[PDB]
Structures are given as structure tokens and as C-alpha cells.
Design a protein around this ligand. Structure first.
Ligand SMILES: Nc1nc2c(ncn2[C@@H]2O[C@H](COP(=O)(O)OP(=O)(O)OP(=O)(O)O)[C@@H](O)[C@H]2O)c(=O)[nH]1
Ligand SMILES: Nc1nc2c(ncn2[C@@H]2O[C@H](COP(=O)(O)OP(=O)(O)O)[C@@H](O)[C@H]2O)c(=O)[nH]1
Lengths: 427, 170, 50, 426
């Protein structure tokens, strides 16, 4: 069994820099690539004692790629994997989807083919992108189009960064998010949202870090992915695979948008004075003070939830804890679904990396749920996208690249149709 | 129901004796496996590789080998009164066909006479052995009678009660 | 030059398209017929045993 | 003599069976390396029911492990008594069902069960006179439910005149691991009603409450639940392996316990089950065994028989005991609580005794009761299934893989007539 991870854009490959850091520090591999069998899902073995990750970093701007070529992990990554363009899409979805995308995605495809050929029991792909940019949005959707026509039956775990409601860095990002979701809708099988303001609030309150940079954000994202692949990498008392989430969490082929959370995100000092058990982390995974997307599931209704458990966890209390959640009335599940949970326990605790701000915790929970509060975020995006589109601001850049007015209106009504779809399943 | 059978036997005995002689081709009393194929050819039907051997095997039970007129009446009577006997009927059918033949291609409506003699039965039961309909006639031959009779006997034989039993409801 | 590059790729794509295997589909069809023949052959033999 | 092959499906089936072969081998005196070290001749004379001598005192279990993920199989050969299974018996896919009953019954089943059947066929012809088959699986998973289900159907078509047991845990709303549990349960049971000879209904709630109150355990990992289930399964077959005053084979119990051919789902219990604080303070008598046996909380299913009436009941006792106590205890427990037993069958309890206890205990028991209270479980899952199906939630992995709408309607109809015929016969 193998899974390969592709990274597109500035935010994508930065996230990868934290993930592969965490991976080698977990499996005891130095950054040069040699040990001083469970690593087979992510690293292929040269046979000379060197381990190479199954990943391809690609983007349109060579700046963020070439610090990676000269960091500590210069020798871990195979050179061909770290694809790099010559000029940026520059926060322009059309420029990444038709002008510059059309030259770079074909090189990525004939690369990713031999990664899959080296694999035997490929479980799927998992993609990392931020929709606010042009690279991660434009050629990301283009790459997903060509991936669906190539494989189809294989899972494509989309861990996307949506633009925050209020905290934003770009100004044309409403255009980019709407047009990108229009294709991310019918290509990604399972798409997980990761906002930025929510992670900002977690590091401010939980980690009690008052001055966080992007490093800490990417660090905890890797922690969630590690908690999600431990079931694939290691044996537990009750394991799930990546094909399990395809069935157990998305009731309709167009409702695939999950709210992620993780617990406990605790600094080095609270852990010393605080107690860890299964019941309280089962609680802490549901409160909105620990969610990764600025929305409130208290406003929505749950379809189905998923629960990753790591460390010294027995199965009797995960059942008792999820029972206590159902008997509470702050959160309610959809009428059509009497049972709304998918639980899982694995033996290996989360390892720590030196230099990170995550404590060594005895046990942890990674929750991945599906709800209807996600419908409020998409609607919130439509108000400010439609706000500017009527007066045709910033449209001239995209239409000058080779697009027209047609795709704005047709993409707009498609995501508008999705709004009505979410409201009718909730009833 | 006895009167139909007794009266039928009273008349068919003379037909049967000539039916026997006619099936014989060597002008003797013994009916060899060789003769049976000749008879089927007259009917216009073809035997399979081992059919004749089974046909000769099952009928004879007082000696081994060729058959004799004495065995033939024993077969006739046992098969005729066989009804709930679950007994063999491989060579009964060919002789009953020949005796019930007077047209030298087969018989049409006479199936009903055969049927009523065996039992009053039903029009639907007739739609079981063949597809003959009251108003229409048909053409028939040896091929379509033996095969259907043989299949019906196999169809009845299969059905038995294991978990197919049905008890009155509570 | 770019037109020739594109044309070769189309010819490759047309070559790859799955094509019906006549010499193999008929084998499957013939295999099923023999299978069904043996089922009916089996029921007559079971009747004989009873 | 009479031989039973063992078939374990899915993760739940594989781990249940691993503890089963450990406990059984300890009863017959085979060390983890697979050699004989017992003392009594009574242990060597009846190991042909479950093992085959290979070469030089090598006894290998007559078992077949079957699933869709490599993690379970590796977890078997890692632990002790993991080196005793023949490696050819590890029939094994690679892709996985993903808790999708259609993938376990139509997509992935089509390429594995043929291979599973070759190993199963080899194990049937390896023995002389089969007593039956023994299948351990779940009803909520995919690779245990669907894979084991199609296997059961094909096997009954091949060897129809042979017994068959299915030890199956069922899902319940309080212990809800998967989300599509009702879709899997109702379709799986729809196949069990027309294929299995008799089924033994298990569930995880009862296992949790047995380890809470009776056993008084603090950290009941799955090893203890599997330890409990293994004691029950060894009890049902002790009659074939050891002589006694009143023997009762599998056929004897099924023909005696099943009054109507479709009503073959049982509730199980086991005695004695005592905590370490009270293992010293107790006695070992037949009546002490009987009340702890017929206890409502001690049932190994979360369906209280005292909500309904008993149709038939069975007791398998092990140890040097007096048959008068056996018969008089069954008569007394039926006379005081007379309303809880069905009326148009007198003496609704069949009892048998075997003269060999489990190792470490002086005297044990095993209860197999066919009550009418089981319809609660069928309704408890049926309404959840109808609730989901009336809006087609989670249906595209079912209808997109090969099921149609009439299959779910067939499942409801068969579900509804079974609960209706339980209601009539009660
Ligand atoms: N969570 C998280 N988000 C990031 C990080 N770095 C950048 N982003 C997000 O990425 C968005 C813009 O996209 P980028 O990835 O920076 O740039 P791009 O997607 O490659 O598009 P271009 O600038 O045209 O190349 C911003 O809105 C940020 O929120 C990061 O380290 N962590
Ligand atoms: N007794 C017991 N039950 C288990 C164990 N592991 C899983 N289960 C049960 O199996 C159900 C989920 O089935 P699963 O293991 O996915 O079945 P499979 O995928 O077909 O092998 C849950 O309801 C659990 O209660 C175990 O080790 N022991």
C-alpha cells in the first residue's frame, strides 16, 4: 500500500517542508536519507540504504523551491521531483489555468506517472493547495481535471486552504475561490478545508503563541496528516484506510467538504499540570474553539463524523465517550442518519520534532466531520464575490488572458446551485 | 376409474400382439437392441450413444440380455399400474406410441384418450405434457412424444420435500 | 514544429484507445455455453441416481 | 472422527480465531511450536477433529484465514501461536472493501472467494466425515459481512447436507463504529436467513457489560472479549472431543433446538464468569452454575429474554457432575418462571454433560437459548435502515457498484416477514 503527496504553490510546498520534516523525525531517518518496513507507504528504498520520499513539489515561481534545494534536506528529495517554473501566475486564476498552466502541468503528469508505476498497491493521491493564489487555484484545478481522466477510481485527498472571511492578503481572491471551487466540486473525492484565521486563533489561545509565523501553522497541519496516516503506516486496535472516508462520510457525490480539528494542541506547560484521557479529548475535538475552519457547526447539522485516536487508547472508552456526545443536545445529527460516527484507534503516539512548539502528549484525537455549517462559508464568499463582479472590477485581467464573461456567470450559478443543494439536504 | 382401464386392456391386447411382432424384424420372439434403432428410425427419432443399452437394461429383470414377450407383458402391466411407483418407463413409451399409432406419423387427439385412461386430469395438465390445444390439431412424430414424456418424468421425480414443506399457519 | 508534436500525441492517443478483443470474447461465450450444457447434463444424472 | 474446518473472515474474524486456537491448543497440550507435550491419552485421541499431524509430532490447526488487508494477517503471525498455521491457508486479497458491503459482495468478492474455496475444498477433502463448518465474522464491517456472506452461500450450494455455524457479532446503536451499519446488517441477515444452518447472535454491548460488572476489569482490551468468545465456542464442541455421560453433537442440538426452519438465531451465555475478588468466595455446584447461567445480564447478547418468551433452550455442561442435578435444575428453573417459557412445547430445555472441564476450572457451563425476544434487534436495525433508505443517503456506492433499488426493498420485505413470523410463533 502506498500514497503519494503532491504540493502546488507557495503554500503547498511550504506545508510539505513541514510534513517530510515530521516524517523522517518519526521514522528515525536523518535528513541525508539513510537509517543510522512501515516507511514503505511514503519512502521508496534505493536498495543502497537510501530512502526517497514519494512527493513532487511544483509551482510557477522558483524562489520557494530553491531554498528547499539548499536547506538541510538537499539530499532527501530526488532532484526531478522538485519541479519549478520560470514566472508566476500572480494571483490570477486564468493565468494559471490557461496561459502558464498549459506548459507546466504536462511535465508534472509524466512525472507523477512513474511515481505511481513504482508503487504497487496505490491507495490514492493527496493534494495540498491554497485556493487564494493563482498557481494552487489555476493549475491545481487543471491538474485535478487531468488526474480524474487518468485514474478516476483512486482517492484524491484535497487538503485545501480557503481564504479567511476577514483576514486576507490578496484582493482578487474572491474571484479565484469561486472559479476554483467550480472544478474542485466535481473532481476531488474528499476535500478538507483549512482556513487561516482558525489556525491563527489556535496558536494564539491554545499554544499561547502571541507572535506566530507560517512555520507553526504548517507544523500542526503536518500533525493532522500524521494522525491520519498512522492508521495506514502502523497497526492499531481498530484501523481504517483512506478508502474508508470515501464511503463513510459523504452522503451525496457533491457534498464532500469536511471540517477538521485536532486535540490536544497544548503547550509545554499545560501538559505538566493537566490530565490526558480519552473522554476529555473526545470532548475537546468537538468544541468550536478547536476547529480549523471559521464556521460554527452549532449552526449546522451533522451528517457523519470521523474520529482518529492515537496513543495509549483502549476501545471501551472511545465508545463510552462518543455515547456521551450523542446524548448531549448542543449538537444534533440529520434525521436520515440514526448513527453518525466513524471511530478509529491506533497504537502509535504522535512523535515530536525538536524546534516545534507541540508538547509530547500521551494521547491525541484527530476529528474529521461533515456538517452544514460549511454551507454558510460558501454563501459568505458569494456575497463579496458578487459584490464586485457586477461593476466588472478586475475582470479585464482574466478576460485579457483569454477568458470571457461567460465562465463567470456559469461558474457563479453552479456554486449558487450548490447553495440550494446544501439547504435541501439539511431539511 | 377401473372400467376405463379394464375396457382399454380388453381392446389393446390384440393391438399389442401385432405391435410386438411388428417391432421384431427377424421374425422371432426376441427384441434385440438392434431392432430398437430401426423402430426409432421408423418413428423418425435418433437415440443417443448409450440410450439403447439403458432401454434394454431397465426393462428386463428375470434374465439378462435380449428381451422376450413374457418380459414385455410383465413390463406393460407393471408400468400401466405403476402410477405411484416411481418406476422406470423407458421402453413403455416407445411401445405405447406404436400401439397408439395407426396413421404412421404419430397421433394427434388420441393423446387425450391416453390421458383420460391414465387419469381425468385437467386441460391445464394436458398443457403440461405438450402444447396441444382443444381446437387446433398439429402434426406430431416420435421425436416430440418420447422427449416430453421423459422430461415430465424427470420433472416429477426431482420435486421432494426438504424445506419446501409448508405447514398450516399458527 | 508544435503542430507536428501535437499530431504525434493524437496518433499515440488513438493507438491506446481500448479495442474489442474478438479472439477472446468469443472464447468467453463458448465457455459459458459448455458450462450451461454441463449443468443440464448434471440434473439428468442426478435424476437417474434417485 | 467427525471434523470441523474453521473459517475466519475480516479483522474481527481473524482476531477472534487467533485467541480461539491458542485456548484450544492449551486444552490439548500443544506448545506454540506445534508439538505434543500432553500426558493423558484423552488429549491425543481426539485431535483429528481440529488438527492434522504433519511430520514428527507437528500438529497444524485446520483453519483458513481470509480478509482484504495485510495488517490483520501480519498481526496473526507476529503473536504467539502464530507460527502454527500453515502459510498456504492465508487466502488473501490486497485492495480492500472499505466497509462497502457491495465491494465485499460484488466487486472484490468475485476475485477472492474462488481462491478461498480452493483452500476450503482442500480442507474438506482432507478429512473423512465432515461434521460441519465454523465461520467467525461480523455483521457491520464490509470484508467480514460481504466476503463471509457470499462464501456461506456458495458453500451451502456445494455441501448442503452438512452442518454450519456462524458466530457473528452484530451492531447496535450504542456501540456504533461504522456509519453504514444498518445497510450492512439488514442485507447480511437477509442472506443468513436462507443460507446458514444456524447462527449465533453476538454483539459488543453485552461483551462490554460482562467485562464491566461480572469480570470487573479495569482495561478490557479486545483480547479479553475474544477470550470470552473463545470459551463459548470451545464449549459448543467439547462433546465431539471428550467422552461423557450425555453427549450432544452439533446436529443433535440443531435438530432439537430449531422448531421452525427460518428461526435459527440464538442467544448465548457462559458460566462460570467470576472476578478475581470473588473467585475464592464462591462454590461450584450445579444450581449455583444454573442461576448464573440463566441470568439476564449474563447473556452474551444485548437482547433481554425477559422481554419475551423462550422457545427452546440448551445447556452444555462440562466437568464431573451428577446427571440428576442436571435434570432437576432444568425442571425447577422452568417451573417457577413458568410464564417466560413457551406453552405448546413441554420441556423446552435440552441438557447434556461432558466429563472434561476447561483447564484451570473444576466445573463450567454453556447456555444456548432460542428465545423470541430477538425480534427487538431486527426492528432496532430495520427502522434505522428504512430511515436511511427513504432519502437514498449513502446509496451511490451501493447502486453504482451493482445493487438496484429492488434489493433493498427485498431486504426490508424479508426483514419484515421474519419479525412478523417471530411475532406469530411467540
Ligand atoms: N496555512 C497557510 N497558508 C499559507 C501559507 N503560506 C501562504 N499561505 C496562503 O496562500 C495564499 C496565497 O497563495 P500562495 O500559496 O502564497 O501563492 P500561490 O498559491 O502559489 O499563488 P501565486 O502567488 O500566484 O504563486 C495566502 O492567502 C495565504 O493564506 C502557509 O504557510 N500556511
Ligand atoms: N470482539 C471483537 N470485536 C471487534 C474487534 N475488532 C473489531 N471488532 C468489531 O468489528 C466491528 C467493525 O468491523 P470490522 O473490524 O471493520 O470488520 P471487517 O472490516 O469486516 O473485518 C465493530 O463493531 C467492532 O465491535 C476485536 O478485536 N474483537
Amino acid at each position: 500500500r502506498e500514497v503519494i503527496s503532491i504540493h502546488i504553490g507557495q503554500a503547498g510546498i511550504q506545508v510539505g517542508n513541514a510534513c517530510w520534516e515530521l516524517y523522517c523525525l518519526e521514522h528515525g531517518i536523518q535528513p541525508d536519507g539513510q537509517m543510522p518496513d512501515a516507511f514503505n507507504t511514503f519512502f521508496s528504498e534505493t536498495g543502497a540504504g537510501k530512502h526517497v520520499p514519494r512527493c513532487i513539489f511544483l509551482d510557477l515561481e522558483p524562489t520557494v523551491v530553491d531554498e528547499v534545494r539548499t536547506g538541510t534536506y538537499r539530499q532527501l528529495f530526488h532532484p526531478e521531483q522538485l519541479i519549478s517554473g520560470k514566472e508566476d501566475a500572480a494571483n490570477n486564476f486564468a493565468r494559471g489555468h490557461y496561459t502558464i498552466g498549459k506548459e507546466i502541468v504536462d511535465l508534472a503528469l509524466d512525472r507523477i506517472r512513474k511515481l505511481a508505476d513504482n508503487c504497487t498497491g496505490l491507495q490514492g493521491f493527496l493534494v495540498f493547495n491554497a485556493v487564494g493564489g493563482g498557481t494552487g487555484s489555476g493549475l491545481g484545478s487543471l491538474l485535478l481535471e487531468r488526474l480524474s481522466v487518468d485514474y478516476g477510481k483512486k482517492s484524491k485527498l484535497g487538503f485545501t486552504v480557503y481564504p479567511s472571511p476577514q483576514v486576507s492578503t490578496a484582493v482578487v481572491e474572491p474571484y479565484n475561490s469561486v472559479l476554483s471551487t467550480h472544478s474542485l466540486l466535481e473532481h476531488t473525492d474528499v476535500a478538507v478545508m483549512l482556513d487561516n484565521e482558525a489556525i491563527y486563533d489556535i496558536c494564539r489561545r491554545s499554544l499561547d503563541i502571541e507572535r506566530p509565523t507560517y512555520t507553526n501553522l504548517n507544523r500542526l497541519i503536518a500533525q493532522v496528516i500524521s494522525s491520519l496516516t498512522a492508521s495506514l503506516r502502523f497497526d492499531g486496535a481498530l484501523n481504517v484506510d483512506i478508502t474508508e472516508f470515501q464511503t463513510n462520510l459523504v452522503p451525496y457525490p457533491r457534498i464532500h467538504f469536511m471540517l477538521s480539528s485536532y486535540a490536544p494542541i497544548i503547550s509545554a506547560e499545560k501538559a505538566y499540570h493537566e490530565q490526558l484521557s480519552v473522554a476529555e479529548i473526545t470532548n475537546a475535538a468537538f468544541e468550536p474553539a478547536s476547529m480549523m475552519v471559521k464556521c460554527d457547526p452549532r449552526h449546522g447539522k451533522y451528517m457523519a463524523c470521523c474520529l482518529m485516536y492515537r496513543g495509549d487508547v483502549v476501545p471501551k472508552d472511545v465508545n463510552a465517550s462518543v455515547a456521551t456526545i450523542k446524548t448531549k443536545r448542543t449538537i444534533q445529527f440529520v434525521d436520515w442518519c440514526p448513527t453518525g460516527f466513524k471511530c478509529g484507534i491506533n497504537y502509535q503516539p504522535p512523535t515530536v520534532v525538536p524546534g516545534g512548539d507541540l508538547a509530547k502528549v500521551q494521547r491525541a484525537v484527530c476529528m474529521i466531520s461533515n456538517s452544514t455549517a460549511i454551507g454558510e462559508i460558501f454563501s459568505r464568499l458569494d456575497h463579496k464575490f458578487d459584490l464586485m463582479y457586477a461593476k466588472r472590477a478586475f475582470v479585464h485581467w482574466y478576460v485579457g488572458e483569454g477568458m470571457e464573461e461567460g465562465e463567470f456567470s456559469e461558474a457563479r450559478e453552479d456554486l449558487a446551485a450548490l447553495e440550494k443543494d446544501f439547504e435541501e439536504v439539511g431539511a | 376409474a377401473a372400467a376405463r382401464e379394464r375396457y382399454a386392456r380388453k381392446n389393446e391386447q390384440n393391438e399389442l400382439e401385432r405391435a410386438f411382432n411388428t417391432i421384431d424384424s427377424k421374425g422371432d420372439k426376441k427384441i434385440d437392441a438392434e431392432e430398437l434403432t430401426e423402430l426409432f428410425l421408423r418413428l423418425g427419432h435418433k437415440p443417443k450413444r448409450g440410450e439403447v443399452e439403458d432401454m434394454i437394461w431397465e426393462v428386463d429383470e428375470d434374465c439378462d440380455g435380449c428381451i422376450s414377450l413374457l418380459e414385455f407383458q410383465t413390463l406393460y402391466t407393471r408400468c400401466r399400474d405403476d402410477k405411484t411407483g416411481y418406476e422406470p418407463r423407458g421402453l413403455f413409451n416407445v411401445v405405447e406410441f406404436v400401439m397408439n399409432d395407426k396413421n404412421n406419423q404419430g397421433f394427434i387427439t388420441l393423446e387425450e384418450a391416453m390421458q383420460i385412461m391414465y387419469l381425468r386430469y385437467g386441460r391445464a395438465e394436458l398443457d403440461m405434457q405438450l402444447e396441444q390445444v382443444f381446437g387446433t390439431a398439429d402434426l406430431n412424430s416420435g421425436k416430440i412424444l418420447t422427449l416430453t414424456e421423459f422430461l415430465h418424468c424427470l420433472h416429477t421425480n426431482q420435486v421432494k420435500q426438504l424445506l419446501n414443506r409448508v405447514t398450516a399457519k399458527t | 514544429n508544435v503542430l507536428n508534436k501535437q499530431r504525434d500525441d493524437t496518433t499515440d492517443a488513438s493507438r491506446l484507445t481500448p479495442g474489442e478483443l474478438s479472439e477472446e470474447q468469443a472464447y468467453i461465450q463458448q465457455l459459458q455455453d459448455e458450462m450451461k450444457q454441463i449443468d443440464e447434463e448434471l440434473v439428468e444424472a442426478e435424476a437417474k441416481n434417485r | 472422527m467427525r471434523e470441523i474446518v474453521h473459517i475466519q473472515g475480516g479483522q474481527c474474524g481473524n482476531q477472534i480465531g487467533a485467541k480461539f486456537w491458542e485456548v484450544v491448543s492449551d486444552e490439548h497440550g500443544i506448545d506454540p511450536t506445534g508439538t505434543y507435550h500432553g500426558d493423558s491419552d484423552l488429549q491425543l485421541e481426539r485431535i483429528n477433529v481440529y488438527f492434522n499431524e504433519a511430520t514428527g509430532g507437528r500438529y497444524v490447526p485446520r483453519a483458513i484465514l481470509m480478509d482484504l488487508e495485510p495488517g490483520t494477517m501480519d498481526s496473526v503471525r507476529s503473536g504467539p501461536y502464530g507460527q502454527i498455521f500453515r502459510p498456504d491457508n492465508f487466502v488473501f486479497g490486497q485492495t480492500g472493501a472499505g466497509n462497502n458491503w457491495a465491494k465485499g459482495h460484488y466487486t472484490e468478492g468475485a476475485e477472492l472467494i474462488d481462491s478461498v474455496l480452493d483452500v476450503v475444498r482442500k480442507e474438506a477433502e482432507s478429512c473423512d466425515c465432515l461434521q460441519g463448518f465454523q465461520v467467525c465474522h461480523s455483521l457491520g464491517g464490509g470484508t467480514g459481512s460481504g466476503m463471509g456472506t457470499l462464501l456461506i452461500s456458495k458453500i451451502r450450494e456445494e455441501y448442503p447436507d452438512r452442518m454450519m455455524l456462524t458466530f457473528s457479532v452484530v451492531p447496535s446503536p450504542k456501540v456504533s463504529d461504522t456509519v453504514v451499519e444498518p445497510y450492512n446488517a439488514t442485507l447480511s441477515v437477509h442472506q443468513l436467513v436462507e443460507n446458514a444452518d444456524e447462527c449465533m447472535v453476538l454483539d459488543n454491548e453485552a461483551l462490554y457489560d460482562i467485562c464491566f460488572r461480572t469480570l470487573k476489569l479495569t482495561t478490557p482490551t479486545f483480547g479479553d472479549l475474544n477470550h470470552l468468545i473463545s470459551a463459548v465456542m470451545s464449549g459448543i464442541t467439547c462433546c465431539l472431543r471428550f467422552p461423557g455421560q450425555l453427549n450432544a453433537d452439533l446436529r443433535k442440538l440443531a435438530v432439537n433446538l430449531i422448531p421452525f426452519p427460518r428461526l435459527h438465531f440464538f442467544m448465548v451465555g457462559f458460566t462460570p464468569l467470576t472476578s478475581r475478588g470473588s473467585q475464592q468466595y464462591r462454590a461450584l455446584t450445579v444450581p449455583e452454575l444454573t442461576q448464573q447461567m440463566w441470568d439476564a445480564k449474563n447473556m452474551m447478547c444485548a437482547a433481554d429474554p425477559r422481554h419475551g418468551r423462550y422457545l427452546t433452550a440448551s445447556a452444555l455442561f462440562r466437568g464431573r457432575m451428577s446427571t440428576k442435578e442436571v435434570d432437576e435444575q432444568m425442571l425447577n428453573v422452568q417451573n417457577k418462571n413458568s410464564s417466560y417459557f413457551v406453552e405448546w412445547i413441554p420441556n423446552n430445555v435440552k441438557s447434556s454433560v461432558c466429563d472434561i472441564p476447561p483447564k484451570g476450572l473444576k466445573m463450567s457451563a454453556t447456555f444456548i437459548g432460542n428465545s423470541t425476544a430477538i425480534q427487538e434487534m431486527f426492528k432496532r436495525v430495520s427502522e434505522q435502515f428504512t430511515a436511511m433508505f427513504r432519502r437514498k443517503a449513502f446509496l451511490h456506492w451501493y447502486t453504482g457498484e451493482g445493487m438496484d433499488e429492488m434489493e433493498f426493498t427485498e431486504a426490508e420485505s424479508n426483514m419484515n416477514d421474519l419479525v412478523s413470523e417471530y411475532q406469530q410463533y411467540q
